[PDB]
Protein backbone atom coordinates (compact mmCIF):
# COMPACT_ATOMS: atom_id res chain seq x y z
CA UNK A 1 0.00 0.00 0.00
CA UNK A 2 1.00 3.67 -0.29
CA UNK A 3 3.09 5.64 2.20
CA UNK A 4 0.75 7.36 4.68
CA UNK A 5 1.41 10.65 6.50
CA UNK A 6 -1.07 11.88 9.11
CA UNK A 7 -3.71 9.41 7.89
CA UNK A 8 -3.52 10.60 4.27
CA UNK A 9 -2.16 8.96 1.13
CA UNK A 10 1.25 10.33 0.21
CA UNK A 11 2.08 7.98 -2.57
CA UNK A 12 5.64 8.69 -3.60
CA UNK A 13 6.67 5.11 -4.25
CA UNK A 14 9.71 3.13 -3.27
CA UNK A 15 12.23 5.67 -4.60
CA UNK A 16 11.27 8.04 -1.76
CA UNK A 17 11.21 6.76 1.84
CA UNK A 18 11.31 8.05 5.49
CA UNK A 19 8.70 10.76 5.02
CA UNK A 20 8.31 13.74 7.38
CA UNK A 21 5.41 16.21 7.31
CA UNK A 22 6.33 19.86 6.60
CA UNK A 23 3.03 21.68 6.03
CA UNK A 24 0.04 22.46 3.79
CA UNK A 25 0.55 23.92 0.31
CA UNK A 26 -2.12 25.48 -1.92
CA UNK A 27 -3.40 22.15 -3.35
CA UNK A 28 -2.11 19.59 -0.82
CA UNK A 29 0.22 18.33 1.85
CA UNK A 30 4.02 18.94 1.68
CA UNK A 31 6.67 16.50 3.04
CA UNK A 32 10.38 15.72 2.93
CA UNK A 33 11.62 12.24 2.03
CA UNK A 34 14.83 10.36 1.34
CA UNK A 35 15.66 9.94 -2.45
CA UNK A 36 17.19 6.43 -2.66
CA UNK A 37 18.63 7.18 -6.17
CA UNK A 38 20.42 10.52 -5.46
CA UNK A 39 21.05 9.70 -1.75
CA UNK A 40 19.78 13.04 -0.36
CA UNK A 41 16.61 14.21 1.31
CA UNK A 42 14.19 16.06 -1.01
CA UNK A 43 11.02 18.12 -0.73
CA UNK A 44 7.76 16.71 -2.12
CA UNK A 45 4.51 18.59 -2.71
CA UNK A 46 1.26 16.70 -3.21
CA UNK A 47 -0.97 18.54 -5.68
CA UNK A 48 -4.63 17.66 -6.35
CA UNK A 49 -5.85 20.32 -8.81
CA UNK A 50 -8.14 18.45 -11.20
CA UNK A 51 -11.53 19.49 -9.79
CA UNK A 52 -10.95 23.20 -10.74
CA UNK A 53 -9.79 24.99 -13.92
CA UNK A 54 -7.86 27.70 -11.98
CA UNK A 55 -5.91 25.14 -9.91
CA UNK A 56 -5.07 23.29 -13.13
CA UNK A 57 -3.90 26.52 -14.76
CA UNK A 58 -1.60 27.50 -11.86
CA UNK A 59 -0.18 23.95 -11.62
CA UNK A 60 0.43 23.59 -15.34
CA UNK A 61 2.07 27.04 -15.63
CA UNK A 62 4.46 26.31 -12.75
CA UNK A 63 5.35 22.89 -14.12
CA UNK A 64 5.93 24.28 -17.64
CA UNK A 65 8.04 27.16 -16.35
CA UNK A 66 10.18 25.15 -13.95
CA UNK A 67 10.81 22.32 -16.40
CA UNK A 68 11.98 24.83 -19.06
CA UNK A 69 14.10 26.95 -16.71
CA UNK A 70 17.58 25.93 -15.77
CA UNK A 71 19.36 28.32 -13.46
CA UNK A 72 21.38 28.07 -10.29
CA UNK A 73 19.18 30.58 -8.46
CA UNK A 74 15.85 29.00 -9.42
CA UNK A 75 14.43 25.84 -7.89
CA UNK A 76 14.13 22.97 -10.38
CA UNK A 77 11.74 20.05 -10.57
CA UNK A 78 13.73 16.86 -10.03
CA UNK A 79 10.85 14.40 -10.49
CA UNK A 80 7.11 14.30 -10.89
CA UNK A 81 5.18 11.29 -9.58
CA UNK A 82 1.75 10.39 -10.87
CA UNK A 83 -0.32 7.37 -11.94
CA UNK A 84 0.37 5.76 -15.32
CA UNK A 85 -2.96 6.61 -16.80
CA UNK A 86 -5.13 9.73 -16.90
CA UNK A 87 -8.04 7.71 -15.48
CA UNK A 88 -6.01 6.71 -12.42
CA UNK A 89 -4.30 10.15 -11.98
CA UNK A 90 -5.89 12.23 -9.25
CA UNK A 91 -2.78 13.72 -7.63
CA UNK A 92 0.64 14.79 -8.79
CA UNK A 93 3.71 14.93 -6.54
CA UNK A 94 6.47 17.41 -7.37
CA UNK A 95 9.93 16.56 -6.06
CA UNK A 96 12.45 19.36 -5.55
CA UNK A 97 15.69 20.00 -3.73
CA UNK A 98 15.31 20.29 0.05
CA UNK A 99 17.09 23.38 1.32
CA UNK A 100 18.21 24.24 4.84
CA UNK A 101 15.88 27.19 5.40
CA UNK A 102 14.06 30.05 3.74
CA UNK A 103 14.60 33.75 4.15
CA UNK A 104 11.32 34.15 6.10
CA UNK A 105 12.56 31.76 8.84
CA UNK A 106 16.01 33.32 8.77
CA UNK A 107 14.76 36.87 9.25
CA UNK A 108 12.59 35.77 12.22
CA UNK A 109 15.69 34.69 14.16
CA UNK A 110 18.95 35.97 12.61
CA UNK A 111 20.58 39.30 12.09
CA UNK A 112 22.07 39.41 8.58
CA UNK A 113 25.52 40.80 8.07
CA UNK A 114 25.88 43.48 5.31
CA UNK A 115 27.89 40.91 3.40
CA UNK A 116 25.02 38.43 3.62
CA UNK A 117 22.45 41.08 2.54
CA UNK A 118 24.63 41.88 -0.42
CA UNK A 119 25.10 38.30 -1.44
CA UNK A 120 21.42 37.41 -1.01
CA UNK A 121 20.34 40.43 -3.04
CA UNK A 122 22.81 39.57 -5.80
CA UNK A 123 21.46 36.05 -6.09
CA UNK A 124 17.84 37.18 -6.06
CA UNK A 125 18.54 39.61 -8.87
CA UNK A 126 20.64 37.08 -10.78
CA UNK A 127 17.73 34.65 -10.72
CA UNK A 128 15.27 37.37 -11.56
CA UNK A 129 17.35 38.44 -14.56
CA UNK A 130 16.88 34.97 -15.94
CA UNK A 131 13.13 34.85 -15.17
CA UNK A 132 12.55 38.27 -16.78
CA UNK A 133 14.70 37.32 -19.77
CA UNK A 134 12.25 34.51 -20.40
CA UNK A 135 9.41 37.02 -20.49
CA UNK A 136 8.08 35.62 -17.22
CA UNK A 137 7.02 37.48 -14.09
CA UNK A 138 7.22 35.73 -10.75
CA UNK A 139 4.56 37.87 -9.11
CA UNK A 140 4.93 36.53 -5.58
CA UNK A 141 8.46 37.24 -4.47
CA UNK A 142 8.73 37.31 -0.69
CA UNK A 143 11.06 35.88 1.94
CA UNK A 144 9.34 32.47 2.21
CA UNK A 145 9.86 31.95 -1.51
CA UNK A 146 13.63 32.38 -1.19
CA UNK A 147 15.38 29.21 -0.17
CA UNK A 148 18.90 28.91 1.29
CA UNK A 149 21.23 25.98 1.63
CA UNK A 150 23.78 25.60 4.45
CA UNK A 151 26.28 27.78 2.57
CA UNK A 152 23.76 30.56 1.81
CA UNK A 153 23.27 29.77 -1.85
CA UNK A 154 19.82 31.02 -2.76
CA UNK A 155 17.03 29.69 -4.97
CA UNK A 156 13.76 31.32 -5.91
CA UNK A 157 10.75 29.07 -5.50
CA UNK A 158 6.91 29.05 -6.02
CA UNK A 159 5.86 30.00 -9.50
CA UNK A 160 2.17 29.44 -8.65
CA UNK A 161 1.23 33.05 -9.60
CA UNK A 162 3.73 33.51 -12.41
CA UNK A 163 2.60 34.82 -15.77
CA UNK A 164 4.04 35.75 -19.13
CA UNK A 165 4.65 39.49 -19.14
CA UNK A 166 1.95 41.52 -20.85
CA UNK A 167 2.76 45.21 -20.46
CA UNK A 168 0.29 46.29 -23.18
CA UNK A 169 -2.61 44.85 -21.11
CA UNK A 170 -1.50 46.06 -17.62
CA UNK A 171 -4.09 48.79 -17.09
CA UNK A 172 -7.08 48.33 -14.85
CA UNK A 173 -9.34 50.42 -12.66
CA UNK A 174 -8.93 51.58 -9.12
CA UNK A 175 -9.26 48.96 -6.36
CA UNK A 176 -8.99 45.93 -8.60
CA UNK A 177 -8.61 42.75 -6.52
CA UNK A 178 -5.21 41.11 -6.60
CA UNK A 179 -3.88 37.62 -5.81
CA UNK A 180 -0.32 38.06 -4.65
CA UNK A 181 0.89 38.56 -1.06
CA UNK A 182 -0.24 41.91 0.23
CA UNK A 183 2.90 43.21 1.88
CA UNK A 184 4.99 42.93 -1.27
CA UNK A 185 2.53 44.61 -3.70
CA UNK A 186 3.68 47.60 -5.61
CA UNK A 187 1.62 50.78 -5.21
CA UNK A 188 0.24 50.64 -8.70
CA UNK A 189 -1.58 47.37 -7.96
CA UNK A 190 -4.05 49.30 -5.82
CA UNK A 191 -4.32 52.11 -8.37
CA UNK A 192 -4.23 50.95 -12.00
CA UNK A 193 -2.12 47.85 -12.61
CA UNK A 194 -2.77 44.11 -13.06
CA UNK A 195 0.82 43.19 -12.24
CA UNK A 196 1.71 42.24 -15.84
CA UNK A 197 4.92 44.27 -16.05
CA UNK A 198 8.44 43.40 -14.85
CA UNK A 199 8.43 46.39 -12.49
CA UNK A 200 6.06 44.47 -10.25
CA UNK A 201 8.82 42.09 -9.28
CA UNK A 202 11.41 44.79 -8.69
CA UNK A 203 9.12 46.40 -6.10
CA UNK A 204 8.87 43.11 -4.28
CA UNK A 205 12.68 42.76 -4.30
CA UNK A 206 12.96 46.24 -2.84
CA UNK A 207 10.59 45.18 -0.06
CA UNK A 208 12.75 42.13 0.57
CA UNK A 209 15.90 44.24 0.74
CA UNK A 210 14.25 46.53 3.28
CA UNK A 211 13.19 43.51 5.30
CA UNK A 212 16.76 42.13 5.26
CA UNK A 213 18.05 45.48 6.59
CA UNK A 214 15.73 45.56 9.64
CA UNK A 215 14.23 42.06 10.06
CA UNK A 216 10.71 43.48 9.75
CA UNK A 217 8.48 43.93 6.75
CA UNK A 218 8.67 47.49 5.52
CA UNK A 219 4.98 47.81 4.47
CA UNK A 220 2.86 45.44 6.64
CA UNK A 221 -0.60 46.50 5.45
CA UNK A 222 -3.55 44.82 7.20
CA UNK A 223 -6.01 45.04 4.27
CA UNK A 224 -6.04 46.04 0.61
CA UNK A 225 -6.00 49.83 0.82
CA UNK A 226 -3.89 49.94 4.02
CA UNK A 227 -1.06 48.56 1.93
CA UNK A 228 -1.03 51.81 -0.10
CA UNK A 229 -1.16 54.01 2.98
CA UNK A 230 1.92 52.11 4.42
CA UNK A 231 3.77 52.77 1.14
CA UNK A 232 2.80 56.45 1.06
CA UNK A 233 3.66 56.78 4.75
CA UNK A 234 7.32 56.18 3.80
CA UNK A 235 7.68 57.41 0.21
CA UNK A 236 5.49 60.45 0.90
CA UNK A 237 2.92 61.97 -1.37
CA UNK A 238 3.48 61.43 -5.08
CA UNK A 239 4.75 64.27 -7.20
CA UNK A 240 2.64 66.03 -9.73
CA UNK A 241 4.56 64.37 -12.55
CA UNK A 242 3.92 60.92 -11.03
CA UNK A 243 0.26 61.66 -10.51
CA UNK A 244 -0.06 62.86 -14.06
CA UNK A 245 1.07 59.43 -15.17
CA UNK A 246 -2.07 57.87 -13.58
CA UNK A 247 -4.80 58.67 -16.10
CA UNK A 248 -7.56 56.80 -14.29
CA UNK A 249 -9.57 59.44 -12.54
CA UNK A 250 -10.73 57.42 -9.59
CA UNK A 251 -7.20 56.42 -8.74
CA UNK A 252 -5.76 59.90 -9.26
CA UNK A 253 -8.47 61.55 -7.23
CA UNK A 254 -7.97 59.10 -4.38
CA UNK A 255 -4.33 60.15 -4.18
CA UNK A 256 -5.33 63.86 -4.44
CA UNK A 257 -7.75 63.40 -1.53
CA UNK A 258 -5.07 62.43 0.93
CA UNK A 259 -3.31 64.87 3.22
CA UNK A 260 0.31 65.59 2.52
CA UNK A 261 2.73 62.90 3.69
CA UNK A 262 6.42 63.56 3.96
CA UNK A 263 9.06 61.19 2.70
CA UNK A 264 10.83 59.29 5.47
CA UNK A 265 14.58 59.39 4.72
CA UNK A 266 15.97 55.91 4.19
CA UNK A 267 18.95 56.57 6.47
CA UNK A 268 16.51 57.35 9.34
CA UNK A 269 14.52 54.15 8.79
CA UNK A 270 17.69 52.10 8.41
CA UNK A 271 20.34 53.77 10.48
CA UNK A 272 22.70 50.78 10.35
CA UNK A 273 22.54 50.23 6.57
CA UNK A 274 25.23 50.66 3.95
CA UNK A 275 24.71 53.90 2.05
CA UNK A 276 24.99 52.14 -1.33
CA UNK A 277 22.31 49.60 -0.23
CA UNK A 278 19.98 52.48 0.53
CA UNK A 279 20.65 54.14 -2.80
CA UNK A 280 19.67 50.91 -4.57
CA UNK A 281 16.65 50.49 -2.24
CA UNK A 282 15.47 53.94 -3.20
CA UNK A 283 15.62 53.00 -6.87
CA UNK A 284 13.72 49.75 -6.42
CA UNK A 285 11.04 51.39 -4.22
CA UNK A 286 10.24 54.12 -6.65
CA UNK A 287 6.51 55.00 -6.81
CA UNK A 288 6.31 55.44 -10.57
CA UNK A 289 6.84 52.01 -12.17
CA UNK A 290 8.25 53.51 -15.36
CA UNK A 291 11.02 55.17 -13.34
CA UNK A 292 11.75 52.09 -11.24
CA UNK A 293 15.10 50.41 -11.82
CA UNK A 294 15.09 47.26 -14.00
CA UNK A 295 16.80 44.05 -12.96
CA UNK A 296 19.98 44.52 -15.06
CA UNK A 297 20.51 48.05 -13.84
CA UNK A 298 20.14 46.84 -10.31
CA UNK A 299 22.81 44.21 -10.92
CA UNK A 300 25.10 46.97 -12.20
CA UNK A 301 24.57 49.18 -9.14
CA UNK A 302 27.64 49.98 -7.02
CA UNK A 303 26.23 48.07 -4.05
CA UNK A 304 26.72 44.84 -6.00
CA UNK A 305 30.13 45.63 -7.53
CA UNK A 306 31.86 42.75 -5.75
CA UNK A 307 29.59 40.29 -7.61
CA UNK A 308 28.45 41.89 -10.83
CA UNK A 309 29.56 40.00 -13.90
CA UNK A 310 27.10 40.02 -16.76
CA UNK A 311 28.86 37.10 -18.47
CA UNK A 312 28.07 34.97 -15.43
CA UNK A 313 24.43 36.22 -15.15
CA UNK A 314 22.76 34.02 -17.77
CA UNK A 315 19.65 34.58 -19.71
CA UNK A 316 17.07 32.13 -20.99
CA UNK A 317 17.59 30.41 -24.31
CA UNK A 318 13.86 30.07 -24.99
CA UNK A 319 11.62 32.81 -23.63
CA UNK A 320 7.85 32.16 -23.32
CA UNK A 321 5.20 33.84 -25.53
CA UNK A 322 -9.18 25.79 -21.68
CA UNK A 323 -11.54 23.56 -19.60
CA UNK A 324 -10.11 21.54 -16.71
CA UNK A 325 -10.50 18.20 -18.60
CA UNK A 326 -8.18 19.57 -21.28
CA UNK A 327 -5.80 20.97 -18.65
CA UNK A 328 -5.61 17.51 -16.98
CA UNK A 329 -4.52 16.12 -20.35
CA UNK A 330 -1.84 18.81 -20.72
CA UNK A 331 -0.56 18.12 -17.17
CA UNK A 332 -0.47 14.41 -17.93
CA UNK A 333 1.54 15.16 -21.08
CA UNK A 334 3.82 17.74 -19.42
CA UNK A 335 4.71 15.16 -16.68
CA UNK A 336 5.20 12.17 -19.04
CA UNK A 337 9.02 12.49 -19.19
CA UNK A 338 9.30 11.30 -15.57
CA UNK A 339 7.59 7.95 -16.19
CA UNK A 340 9.92 4.90 -16.43
C1 LIG B 1 8.86 27.33 -2.57
C2 LIG B 1 9.28 26.44 -1.45
C3 LIG B 1 8.43 25.22 -1.31
O1 LIG B 1 7.49 24.98 -2.07
N1 LIG B 1 8.76 24.39 -0.32
C4 LIG B 1 7.91 23.25 0.03
C5 LIG B 1 8.56 22.70 1.28
C6 LIG B 1 9.21 23.87 1.89
C7 LIG B 1 9.82 24.59 0.67
C8 LIG B 1 11.13 23.99 0.27
C9 LIG B 1 12.30 23.95 1.10
C10 LIG B 1 12.53 24.46 2.46
C11 LIG B 1 13.40 23.79 3.30
C12 LIG B 1 13.62 24.26 4.57
N2 LIG B 1 13.01 25.35 5.05
C13 LIG B 1 12.17 26.00 4.25
C14 LIG B 1 11.90 25.59 2.97
N3 LIG B 1 13.29 23.34 0.45
N4 LIG B 1 12.79 22.99 -0.76
C15 LIG B 1 11.51 23.37 -0.88
C16 LIG B 1 10.76 23.08 -2.13
Swiss-Prot record:
Result when mutating residue 309 to G: In NS13; results in increased MAPK signaling; increased translocation to the nucleus; reduced interaction with DUSP6; no effect on interaction with MAP2K1
Entry EC no(s): 2.7.11.24
Residue list for modification Phosphothreonine: 176, 181
Domain of life: Eukaryota
Cofactor(s) recorded in Swiss-Prot or TrEMBL: Mg(2+)
PTM statement from Swiss-Prot or TrEMBL: Phosphorylated upon KIT and FLT3 signaling. Dually phosphorylated on Thr-176 and Tyr-178, which activates the enzyme. Undergoes regulatory phosphorylation on additional residues such as Ser-237 and Ser-239 in the kinase insert domain (KID) These phosphorylations, which are probably mediated by more than one kinase, are important for binding of MAPK1/ERK2 to importin-7 (IPO7) and its nuclear translocation. In addition, autophosphorylation of Thr-181 was shown to affect the subcellular localization of MAPK1/ERK2 as well. Ligand-activated ALK induces tyrosine phosphorylation. ISGylated.
Catalytic activity annotation: L-seryl-[protein] + ATP = O-phospho-L-seryl-[protein] + ADP + H(+); L-threonyl-[protein] + ATP = O-phospho-L-threonyl-[protein] + ADP + H(+)
Phosphotyrosine: residues carrying this PTM: 178
GO cellular component: azurophil granule lumen; caveola; centrosome; ciliary basal body; cilium; cytoplasm; cytoskeleton; cytosol
Mechanisms controlling activity: Phosphorylated by MAP2K1/MEK1 and MAP2K2/MEK2 on Thr-176 and Tyr-178 in response to external stimuli like insulin or NGF. Both phosphorylations are required for activity. This phosphorylation causes dramatic conformational changes, which enable full activation and interaction of MAPK1/ERK2 with its substrates. Phosphorylation on Ser-20 by SGK1 results in its activation by enhancing its interaction with MAP2K1/MEK1 and MAP2K2/MEK2. Dephosphorylated and inactivated by DUSP1, DUSP3, DUSP6 and DUSP9. Inactivated by pyrimidylpyrrole inhibitors.
Broadest EC class assigned to this enzyme: transferase
Domain Protein kinase positions: 16-304
Phenotypic consequence of residue 65 to N: In NS13; results in increased MAPK signaling; reduced interaction with DUSP6; no effect on interaction with MAP2K1
DNA-binding span(s): 250-268
Annotated binding of ATP, by residue: 22-30, 45
Protein family membership: Belongs to the protein kinase superfamily. CMGC Ser/Thr protein kinase family. MAP kinase subfamily.
Function: Serine/threonine kinase which acts as an essential component of the MAP kinase signal transduction pathway. MAPK1/ERK2 and MAPK3/ERK1 are the 2 MAPKs which play an important role in the MAPK/ERK cascade. They participate also in a signaling cascade initiated by activated KIT and KITLG/SCF. Depending on the cellular context, the MAPK/ERK cascade mediates diverse biological functions such as cell growth, adhesion, survival and differentiation through the regulation of transcription, translation, cytoskeletal rearrangements. Acts as a transcriptional repressor. Binds to a [GC]AAA[GC] consensus sequence. Repress the expression of interferon gamma-induced genes. Seems to bind to the promoter of CCL5, DMP1, IFIH1, IFITM1, IRF7, IRF9, LAMP3, OAS1, OAS2, OAS3 and STAT1. Transcriptional activity is independent of kinase activity.
Protein name: Mitogen-activated protein kinase 1
Species of origin: Homo sapiens
Amino acid sequence: GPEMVRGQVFDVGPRYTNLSYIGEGAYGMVCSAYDNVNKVRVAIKKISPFEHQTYCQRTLREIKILLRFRHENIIGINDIIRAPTIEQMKDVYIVQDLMETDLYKLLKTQHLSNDHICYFLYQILRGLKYIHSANVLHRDLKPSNLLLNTTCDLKICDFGLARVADPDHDHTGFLTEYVATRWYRAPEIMLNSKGYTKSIDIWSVGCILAEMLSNRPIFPGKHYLDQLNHILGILGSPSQEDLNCIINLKARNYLLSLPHKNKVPWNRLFPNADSKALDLLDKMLTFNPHKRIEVEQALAHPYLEQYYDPSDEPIAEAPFKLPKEKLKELIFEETARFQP
